[PDB]
Write a protein that binds this DNA or RNA. Structure first.
Lengths: 444, 25, 188
RNA sequence: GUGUAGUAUCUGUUCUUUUCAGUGUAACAACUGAAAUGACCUCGAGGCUC
RNA sequence: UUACUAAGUCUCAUGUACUACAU
């Protein structure tokens, strides 16, 4: 008859809870393309203060972690603090450790102390190597140092067992261990020196490595002696089939968090840009682009603009210059939208001229060329506009006509383009891009 | 005040017979 | 796995080797001359090299590779008393710029007189003994002594607050004063 | 030039509950049982310590 | 001038032989 306990310690800050869904999508794209799976994921935070940690802890952390929250921290901290099981896929050095330590500290702190007959622990962190266990435990101590109500003992192989037994004699709220040693300690002396009965929180870090180094049997047996309503988080740089299979076995309604696994834009889309200095030059490029394309002759294009007034203007402009377009926007009667869409889907080598906001929902097949005439200002809009050309192997090209003053636009391009896409273009255009993006970035 | 800065044979040693400290009188 | 290196046989009478250790004996097997261990494949050889065994033999092989004018001044003894017991105080006077005018070459000139407690167990004559002397010495002038029958007088207990400039000893810093401007040495 | 079951032998790797008592052993090893918690002193060692 | 002795157990891999059994 299990003892009930609290796992959700998260109070969403007002500023975060005010965020809309579109805002949250955008924040995830900007944070190195965070991808989530699972139901009910809390919104990412962007500041240590949105987590409701005491001043002590705040001072301590800062001290402990210098600079901005990492993408993994932004998303994993509120999900774990909320008591959810979590799969966190991110590289070593992404700061993942505090992502689980803070919530673990909080959870263990809240539980009643160990009785005079209870060994502990309440929290268990498993690592595949002695070197990682020691590193994790060093972190832990930087927190248990201030607070004498909480101990951690590090239990690994390649190290005296008797030494660690002397520790565990005194009871311990937290254990950091390699799987073999832990199992060895559990079974030792009728399992009377270490109990699993009070473990409510298990973390497995570098989880892919645990299978690599043959620990499936040990970690599987450990999870079998742990209450199944425990909170469990699995952190790993990769997600091999073995881990995927293990998570299904040990987790409930997990939230998976993957940082920039793949590109925000399909890698088969060829992203390009041209930096211009007047609307006129932008228009000169747009025309050169439309003619040039013909020498490579389905093959259709879509010019995206930012407003209905711009769409009308550019439509007339392009007309006066011998180029006929199928123009579309929400200020036009639906009947003529349909006429233009059908004309576009009908006529060979047609050109659609469309507002960026209608891009996600356009009912047309993928195209060979997207010309973004007004650099978009969000990551979400960039994905929807460029995605109009995405088509696995048959993906075409998306090109942005950017103006010298469009700093945020350059920030988006610098974050969504592949490095090798920026290399193949003129090194001065490239250099301006990076300068534009840096200026925007320090602008905040 | 005034602290200014500037600018392995594990089973082998048991087997050897050191499970029980021996003594020469 | 051999990386294209040629390991000559042991009997070929030794081109520099990467490791001048792993050889091939008269037979085809590979051996470590130091370790005297046979290895079937080059992979086993690399396990041997990456193993602690070979390393220990390497360290063992490295260990194998390494293998006075004498002028009596004037003292002024006087029975003192403070609180809570009785102590002695001596006032020794020195020359009045009479002879020290010929020697001023900063040769220990900055060194003040020094006192030490000597047991009479050792004397130039060695006749009688059994008491202590509070000897006081200065470079040019002659040594001076004062008999101390009482086993202990004025032997205080942490007078100052433990500051560590030993000078010569606890005795000198603890209870001596050297008026160098007037040339008067006080001791108590 | 194959497959089923199974065996032996290298080498790599590593040191399993600090102690006590019994079995066991040539002595080990190994096996069998239990378990301190707290305080202090000098340079892991030490206590007619409580 | 260095007065002559080291591997063992476990674990998880590699090296190499082998024994019944079937095409």
């Amino acid at each position: 008859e299990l003892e009930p306990f609290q796992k959700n310690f998260y109070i969403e800050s007002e500023t975060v809870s005010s965020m809309s869904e579109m805002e949250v999508e955008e924040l995830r794209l900007s944070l190195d393309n965070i991808k989530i799976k699972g139901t009910g994921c809390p919104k990412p935070v962007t500041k240590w203060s949105q987590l409701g940690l005491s001043t002590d802890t705040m001072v301590l952390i800062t001290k402990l972690h210098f600079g901005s929250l990492t993408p993994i921290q932004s998303q994993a901290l509120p999900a774990i603090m909320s008591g959810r099981d979590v799969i966190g896929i991110s590289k070593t050095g992404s700061g993942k450790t505090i992502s689980y330590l803070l919530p673990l500290l909080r959870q263990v702190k809240a539980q009643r102390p160990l009785s005079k007959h209870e060994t502990g622990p309440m929290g268990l962190i498993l690592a595949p190597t002695r070197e990682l266990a020691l590193q994790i435990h060093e972190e832990v101590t930087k927190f248990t140092e201030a607070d004498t109500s909480i101990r951690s003992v590090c239990c690994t192989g390649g190290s005296e067992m008797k030494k660690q037994i002397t520790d565990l004699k005194r009871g311990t709220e937290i254990v950091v261990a390699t799987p073999g040693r832990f199992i060895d300690i559990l079974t030792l002396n009728d399992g009377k020196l270490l109990s699993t009965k009070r473990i409510t929180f298990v973390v497995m870090d570098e989880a892919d490595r645990l299978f690599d180094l043959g620990f499936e049997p040990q970690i599987t047996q450990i999870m079998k002696t742990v209450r199944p309503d425990k909170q469990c988080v699995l952190f790993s740089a990769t997600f091999p089939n073995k881990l995927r299979s293990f998570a299904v076995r040990v987790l409930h309604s997990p939230i998976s968090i993957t940082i920039n696994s793949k590109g925000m834009v399909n890698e088969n889309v060829k992203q390009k840009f041209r930096i211009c200095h007047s609307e006129d030059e932008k228009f000169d490029n747009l025309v050169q682009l439309i003619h040039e394309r013909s020498e490579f002759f389905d093959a259709k294009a879509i010019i995206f603009v930012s407003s209905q007034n711009i769409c009308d203007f550019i439509s007339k402009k392009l007309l006066n210059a011998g180029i006929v377009t199928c123009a579309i926007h929400a200020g036009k009667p639906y009947q003529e939208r349909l006429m233009n869409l059908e004309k576009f889907k009908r006529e060979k080598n047609s050109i659609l001229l469309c507002t960026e906001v209608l891009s996600r929902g356009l009912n047309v097949p993928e195209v060979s060329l997207v010309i973004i005439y007004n650099a978009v200002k969000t990551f979400a809009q960039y994905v929807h506009t460029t995605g109009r050309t995405a088509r696995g192997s048959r993906s075409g090209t998306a090109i942005t006509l950017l103006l010298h003053d469009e700093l945020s636009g350059a920030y988006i391009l610098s974050k969504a383009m592949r490095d090798e896409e920026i290399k193949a273009l003129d090194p001065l255009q490239a250099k301006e891009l990076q300068e534009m993006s840096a200026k925007f970035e320090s602008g905040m | 005040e005034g602290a200014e800065q500037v600018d392995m044979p594990y089973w082998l040693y048991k087997l050897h017979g050191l499970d029980r400290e021996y003594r020469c009188e | 796995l051999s990386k294209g290196e040629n390991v000559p046989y042991t009997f070929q009478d030794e081109q520099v080797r990467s490791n001048p250790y792993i050889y091939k004996n008269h037979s085809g097997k590979l051996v470590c001359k130091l370790c005297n261990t046979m290895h079937m494949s080059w992979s086993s050889v690399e396990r041997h090299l990456g193993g602690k065994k070979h390393g220990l033999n390497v360290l063992r092989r490295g260990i194998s590779i390494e293998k006075x004018x004498x002028x009596x001044x004037x003292x002024x003894x006087x029975x003192x008393x403070x609180x809570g017991s009785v102590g002695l105080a001596i006032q020794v006077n020195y020359s009045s710029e009479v002879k020290e005018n010929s020697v001023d070459s900063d040769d220990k000139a900055k060194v003040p007189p020094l006192i030490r407690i000597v047991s009479g167990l050792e004397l130039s004559d060695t006749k009688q003994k059994g008491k202590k002397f509070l000897v006081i010495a200065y470079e040019p002038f002659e040594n001076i002594a004062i008999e101390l029958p009482p086993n202990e007088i004025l032997f205080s207990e942490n007078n100052d607050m433990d500051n560590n400039n030993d000078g010569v000893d606890e005795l000198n810093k603890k209870c001596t004063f050297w008026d160098a401007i007037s040339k008067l040495y006080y001791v108590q």
